[PDB]
Amino acid sequence: NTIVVAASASESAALQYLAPYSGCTMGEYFRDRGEDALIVYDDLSKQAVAYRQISLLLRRPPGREAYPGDVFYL
Amino acid sequence: AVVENNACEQAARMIAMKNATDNAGELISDLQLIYNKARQAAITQEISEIVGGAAAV
Amino acid sequence: SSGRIVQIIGAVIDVEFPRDAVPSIYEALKVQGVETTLEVQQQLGDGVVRSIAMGSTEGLKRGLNVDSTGAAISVPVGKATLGRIMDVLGNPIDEAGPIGEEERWGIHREAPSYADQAGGNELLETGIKVIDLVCPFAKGGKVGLFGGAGVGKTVNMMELIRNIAIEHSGYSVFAGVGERTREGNDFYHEMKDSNVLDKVALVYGQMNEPPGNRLRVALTGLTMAEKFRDEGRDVLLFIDNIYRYTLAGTEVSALLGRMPSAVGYQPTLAEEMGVLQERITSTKKGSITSIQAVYVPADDLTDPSPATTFAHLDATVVLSRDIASLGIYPAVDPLDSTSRQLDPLVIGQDHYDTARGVQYVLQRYKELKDIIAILGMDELSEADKLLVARARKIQRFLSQPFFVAEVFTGSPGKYVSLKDTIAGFKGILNGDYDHLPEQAFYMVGGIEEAVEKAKKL
Amino acid sequence: SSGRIVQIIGAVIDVEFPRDAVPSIYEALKVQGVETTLEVQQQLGDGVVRSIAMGSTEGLKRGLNVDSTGAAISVPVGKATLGRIMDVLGNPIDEAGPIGEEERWGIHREAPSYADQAGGNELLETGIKVIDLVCPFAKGGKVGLFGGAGVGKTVNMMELIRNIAIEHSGYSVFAGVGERTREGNDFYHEMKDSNVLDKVALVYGQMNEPPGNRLRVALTGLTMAEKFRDEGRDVLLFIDNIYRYTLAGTEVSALLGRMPSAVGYQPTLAEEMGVLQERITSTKKGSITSIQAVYVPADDLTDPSPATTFAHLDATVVLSRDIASLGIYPAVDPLDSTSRQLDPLVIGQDHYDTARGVQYVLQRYKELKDIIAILGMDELSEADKLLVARARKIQRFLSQPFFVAEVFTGSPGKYVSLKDTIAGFKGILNGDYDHLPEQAFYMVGGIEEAVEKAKK
Amino acid sequence: SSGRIVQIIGAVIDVEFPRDAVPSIYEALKVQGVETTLEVQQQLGDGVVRSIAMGSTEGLKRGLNVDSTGAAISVPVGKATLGRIMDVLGNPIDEAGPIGEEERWGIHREAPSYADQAGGNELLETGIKVIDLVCPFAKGGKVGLFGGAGVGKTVNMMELIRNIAIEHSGYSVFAGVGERTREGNDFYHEMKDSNVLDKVALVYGQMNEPPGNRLRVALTGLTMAEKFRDEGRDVLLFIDNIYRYTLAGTEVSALLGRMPSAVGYQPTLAEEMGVLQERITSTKKGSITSIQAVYVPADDLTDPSPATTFAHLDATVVLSRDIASLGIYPAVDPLDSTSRQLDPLVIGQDHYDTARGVQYVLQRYKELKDIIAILGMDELSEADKLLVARARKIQRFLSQPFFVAEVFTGSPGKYVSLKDTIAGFKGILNGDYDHLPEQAFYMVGGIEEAVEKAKK
Ligand SMILES: Nc1ncnc2c1ncn2[C@@H]1O[C@H](COP(=O)(O)OP(=O)(O)O)[C@@H](O)[C@H]1O
Ligand SMILES: Nc1ncnc2c1ncn2[C@@H]1O[C@H](COP(=O)(O)OP(=O)(O)O)[C@@H](O)[C@H]1O
Numbered sequence A: 001n002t003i004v005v006a007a008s009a010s011e012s013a014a015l016q017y018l019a020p021y022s023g024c025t026m027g028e029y030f031r032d033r034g035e036d037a038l039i040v041y042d043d044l045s046k047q048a049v050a051y052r053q054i055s056l057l058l059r060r061p062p063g064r065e066a067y068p069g070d071v072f073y074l
Numbered sequence B: 001a002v003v004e005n006n007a008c009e010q011a012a013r014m015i016a017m018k019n020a021t022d023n024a025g026e027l028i029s030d031l032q033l034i035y036n037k038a039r040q041a042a043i044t045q046e047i048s049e050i051v052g053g054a055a056a057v
Numbered sequence C: 001s002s003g004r005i006v007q008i009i010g011a012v013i014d015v016e017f018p019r020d021a022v023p024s025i026y027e028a029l030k031v032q033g034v035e036t037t038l039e040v041q042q043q044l045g046d047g048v049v050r051s052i053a054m055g056s057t058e059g060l061k062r063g064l065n066v067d068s069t070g071a072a073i074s075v076p077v078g079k080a081t082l083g084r085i086m087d088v089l090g091n092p093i094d095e096a097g098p099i100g101e102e103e104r105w106g107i108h109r110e111a112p113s114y115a116d117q118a119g120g121n122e123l124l125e126t127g128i129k130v131i132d133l134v135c136p137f138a139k140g141g142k143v144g145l146f147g148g149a150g151v152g153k154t155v156n157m158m159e160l161i162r163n164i165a166i167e168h169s170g171y172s173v174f175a176g177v178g179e180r181t182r183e184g185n186d187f188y189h190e191m192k193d194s195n196v197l198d199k200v201a202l203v204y205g206q207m208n209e210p211p212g213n214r215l216r217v218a219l220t221g222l223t224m225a226e227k228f229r230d231e232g233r234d235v236l237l238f239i240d241n242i243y244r245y246t247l248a249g250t251e252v253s254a255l256l257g258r259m260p261s262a263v264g265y266q267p268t269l270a271e272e273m274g275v276l277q278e279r280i281t282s283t284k285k286g287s288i289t290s291i292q293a294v295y296v297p298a299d300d301l302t303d304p305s306p307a308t309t310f311a312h313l314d315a316t317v318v319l320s321r322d323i324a325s326l327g328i329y330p331a332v333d334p335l336d337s338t339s340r341q342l343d344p345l346v347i348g349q350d351h352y353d354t355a356r357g358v359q360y361v362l363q364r365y366k367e368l369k370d371i372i373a374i375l376g377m378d379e380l381s382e383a384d385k386l387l388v389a390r391a392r393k394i395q396r397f398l399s400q401p402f403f404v405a406e407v408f409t410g411s412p413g414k415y416v417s418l419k420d421t422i423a424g425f426k427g428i429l430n431g432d433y434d435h436l437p438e439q440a441f442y443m444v445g446g447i448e449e450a451v452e453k454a455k456k457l
Numbered sequence D, E: 001s002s003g004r005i006v007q008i009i010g011a012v013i014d015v016e017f018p019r020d021a022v023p024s025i026y027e028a029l030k031v032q033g034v035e036t037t038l039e040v041q042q043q044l045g046d047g048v049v050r051s052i053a054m055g056s057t058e059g060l061k062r063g064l065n066v067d068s069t070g071a072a073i074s075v076p077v078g079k080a081t082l083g084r085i086m087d088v089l090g091n092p093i094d095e096a097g098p099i100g101e102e103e104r105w106g107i108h109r110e111a112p113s114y115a116d117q118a119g120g121n122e123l124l125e126t127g128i129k130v131i132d133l134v135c136p137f138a139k140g141g142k143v144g145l146f147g148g149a150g151v152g153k154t155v156n157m158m159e160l161i162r163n164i165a166i167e168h169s170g171y172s173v174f175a176g177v178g179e180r181t182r183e184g185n186d187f188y189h190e191m192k193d194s195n196v197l198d199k200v201a202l203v204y205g206q207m208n209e210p211p212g213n214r215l216r217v218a219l220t221g222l223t224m225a226e227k228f229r230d231e232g233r234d235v236l237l238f239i240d241n242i243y244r245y246t247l248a249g250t251e252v253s254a255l256l257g258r259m260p261s262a263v264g265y266q267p268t269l270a271e272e273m274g275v276l277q278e279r280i281t282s283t284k285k286g287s288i289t290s291i292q293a294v295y296v297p298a299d300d301l302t303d304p305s306p307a308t309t310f311a312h313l314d315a316t317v318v319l320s321r322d323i324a325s326l327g328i329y330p331a332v333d334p335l336d337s338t339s340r341q342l343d344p345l346v347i348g349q350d351h352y353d354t355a356r357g358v359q360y361v362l363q364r365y366k367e368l369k370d371i372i373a374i375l376g377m378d379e380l381s382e383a384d385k386l387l388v389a390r391a392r393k394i395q396r397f398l399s400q401p402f403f404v405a406e407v408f409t410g411s412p413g414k415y416v417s418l419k420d421t422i423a424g425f426k427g428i429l430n431g432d433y434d435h436l437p438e439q440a441f442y443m444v445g446g447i448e449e450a451v452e453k454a455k456k
């Protein structure tokens, strides 16, 4: 009954940033056809660390704890 | 013997509350050193964030 | 003449125009072929303007032609906005067709003048006991509901909308700024079921929208409330999160080329706060009663964003994390919340001595709590024991069941009048209920219900 | 073809190449005169690569000719590495001749796949009472020994090497990453004197080295352990300070042109930790059991380098300066040390119930510290007084004399089996030794030695 | 050759010069047609120097011609500075005409060398009994001065000025760093009415001045004290707050765009403290001894500004409200004041035994005062009552009439030598004067004046 989506620790930070949106799209297939789905994001903090790395290496200007300003929007 | 034991009870209560006041002041001095360390670290972290934000703009 | 997009970094887009046709500051711009609007923030020189999108940047490329409208973002105003849901641009986001307005207004405006100001002192009864006791509201006044995440700002705002706006003879504007889509749908069906929706205009920009929407949606709602105020009417205005206007201004700020101020904020924090807050006020033409809930980050009232919001309000209601964590709701801290109408010439002498007596007994018990936590109850004097028992009964009697919170408590809600509140708190303060247990005053309503509950323990 | 040095700032050297001959990322380069090895990190454009030297940069000038080798840094692997000491480049540093290897492996490779992962929960007995009680180990598992400066990390690892060597018959790789040169000489002469040197391969890049050597030496030791794992063996990997890999990535980070992250760290911190830590695992071909010492800066566990290190491990042993200041060694905080093998379907219900009861008694003792400091033990209730008495006997019985700590004290070391540890802590928790004094529970092996120490 | 102003941002002015006539670091520049002086901080390249204005920049434009003086800021030195108020440039700010000096000196110079140190640990006699007994001053030493306002700081400073001028044939220089204008006018009129104005040279750098003036005003007063030291004298130098010197360094370093250090301070904090404090020494010609009042930020002694300041201080004098409420003047706490010279290798065994005996008797009286407060005088023994009587006699003998306080006390002032202080306090400590009442020991000079006071 479960799809497992994995973006582990030695993979690229882009795939670690894009894994909750991809699993959300896979969960949203069942939502759009009148069925019910449940999703776990087991670390959103590590997704924020991966997006902080991508934002610092693109030289976007940082804020509190060197996180980008759009991280709440993330 | 009962009245003299009551006076000895009040003298022991005097010694115990003086000891409780002194140990409370010892814990206050230790926590004040921890507070001054945290205040200095908070000022240093806020200045590092302001300087790193200003260097990227 | 038209410009072209030269740079897209996040929500911030740079457009190059010819040198005789540079758009002004806060001019709306239309991207050709994609349904997106840009608002000009800065003029950078050499024909280049820097702007924020009022939509998603996924379909945008460099090289796209951009037209200028010659004016600011204009939204519909009038009584055609009543009963409708609009976005930041004034387009309808229900499915009820087009808005048939007769007038459009730009969202950027001056504050009213010093000579235009008018302040009354008429009391506005709420039916919540702690709000009627320690923070009395004013008709055409400004109300803040400060508090952290989860302490009850939205439930308190829904109880004030039930106890004020349903029996209000005038019009209302609700502005959802950077909040949950589920709560926005829940409120629309609640005003639709109660036959109240025909007097209320809804303006929504949710938390998943681009930062440009969340930056201007409060200006859109205030523009419709300004048209209703300058028509001569008495207007209500509810903003569920005015902090989200600030936070979206954080999100664009260093990408606009600003160096950061303290605690990571924009350096223009107080000026952007004052430009929005100085237009909300009541004038000599009409009156606006505004209720705004203010988010407090990590329950820190000395964080700079709520500390700049504290000076703009007439009546401040501060919700405590500690009191909600003791299971007590509405969870208003009665020592940290003040009001300008807490004056003996406004509410009378009796109300003022009851409120200051409650605050004195609670401030005394705040200093006695750790002493009972270390040594125990028996080690105090007799007046301390009587004052701690009367204070715990005061802290349980400040609680109240709500009509909008019956899905959370299971128990029905109560409306308590001002005189019932003053008589009940005076009866607890005078020692007329020193024989009842402290659990009899928890979630009851009037003082008679506490007496009825004490016979069931 | 050949390039020319255009920039030297510290350990970081920019080399300009011709445009059809730009070397790849992680390619080794050689300076033509001095034979300094460089390793390419970035391609900046314009023919220019940005690299990190594997050695000293004093004496180098702009304009020197640099050759490219065409491949990465390759170290000797196999049977010939055993008994030998090598540096980061694979050169021998033990004055014993060349290494007679048959193959060399590059030090950069990918992690093994998800389908190649191996599960297992077979218990590894360590002989240390607190480690076997509250955070037990597994074969093919991963161990962190967290702790601040001078709290014991190396003493515990030397005891874990000595007791894990009893029931293990395969090979071992020991990697010194940024620690004391005197500790490397002592461990080599100890293994050479007791004739276990021919099973252990030694790699050392210590505190005296330039930060490229400290940045890349753990990859060399892991490459040798990966060759032993991919021959189908069961191997032990010991790394003294993995924190010192990370700090070497601090020292070159601003010289590589990066904007700093929080508290001055590199922005690629979790990715460098993940790319190193995901190669350490057991696979279906063979198994690696790994013990790593992990430094905690300024005794702060919420510093980002240990806080990123915590989720890469199966068992976590946290040491404390307060417990060592009470005189208790091996100084393990039992309320901060966890492992995934503490689970009733792995170790049984009895051992799990004894460990949960010990942690309950120590947590309720930790909650009474300020009220015991202000008013004393006399104003507690009677069950609270009994629990403080049993808690001090548990805290004294968690200490143990070590075989490697025989030089510090003169008391002989003890090996305690798991059954005696479960029976002794169960007998303390049940009330069987409420008549014993608490100082009889200090620095003994079994509960029977506490019984003989009580009659003295 | 002259230059032109190219940039005005606040008090920071950039001036462009021709390439063969770039002026030196710390050179004084003059704007043509205006009364504005600039001090060069940095050389930026292409002839452009970055400088700090020593006044208001309102009304300055780009394009103004700027002349170079060829040297640093040069102040008048010698006997003509005595009795006069001056600013940081040495211009008079009293309305009393020009200073008639014979010599001008620049304010930047090195510390005296290793071979120019005088040697030994020679004491400076102040004539005050509590200072020469409990916290003795060294020649070339540094004195931290603590306490608030209204407890007699200014009266102690005028008495030190009068004592070093009359009894030791030396001079004094006051440097007010961050001087409030109301208190400087008050201090000037108090020194006219106490006849000590002609013994001290006054330099003020006021609070409403830009922070380079408040940075260089102590160097101006130290230059005048160096000329007085090089005439063969023993000089006192008073610094009104050293924390405002540190904060003016923070402000000047923030205006130049330097990256700030820990807790907000300048990264050159210890160096800018050391350039000022290493010039205050004892040399082979004469000595300068400094008295500097210290503010502590947030009551934190481990803050970087008092931690850098306390590394240079040789003594501390703590002023107390509770001693001044008892009528005892000067209000120096004998238990809280410390000295590095209070050491039996420095001052001998006899002075050390008398001072530690006085400090033990006052500490035992301090705890017995709480005993008398908790349970009454009947709890104490005969030896405790004898120590209370001797301690009240010691506590009243620490008071002394001053020559600058004869309006206040209504008595003639006294100068007490160190020999008479050690002999008098030894005579109280040995029980030689137990037959005298305690009120004879109040406000006299030596112990013989207390003996003739107890006949009246
Ligand atoms: N008056 C109340 N009675 C009962 N539960 C309440 C009350 N107010 C809040 N709560 C509980 O706390 C939650 C958070 O309240 P909410 O108004 O959503 O907080 P906020 O808007 O401040 O984030 C509610 O959903 C409910 O579970
Ligand atoms: N088990 C032990 N018994 C006695 N002393 C110990 C023990 N463990 C550590 N110590 C003491 O602590 C010191 C530091 O230990 P070490 O392992 O070098 O610490 P770390 O690796 O954390 O820097 C030892 O040299 C010794 O003095």
Ligand SMILES: Nc1ncnc2c1ncn2[C@@H]1O[C@H](COP(=O)(O)OP(=O)(O)O)[C@@H](O)[C@H]1O
Pocket: E148, E149, E150, E151, E152, E153, E154, E155, E156, E329, E330, E402, E405, E408, E409
């Ligand atoms: N030596 C002294 N004898 C008598 N009274 C003194 C003496 N020194 C100070 N006082 C009293 O203390 C008060 C404060 O002195 P002052 O030096 O002016 O402190 P501040 O300069 O901080 O105001 C004076 O008004 C004076 O009455």
Ligand SMILES: [Mg+2]
Pocket: C153, C154
């Ligand atoms: Mg809410």
Ligand SMILES: [Mg+2]
Pocket: D153, D154, D155, D179
């Ligand atoms: Mg070690």
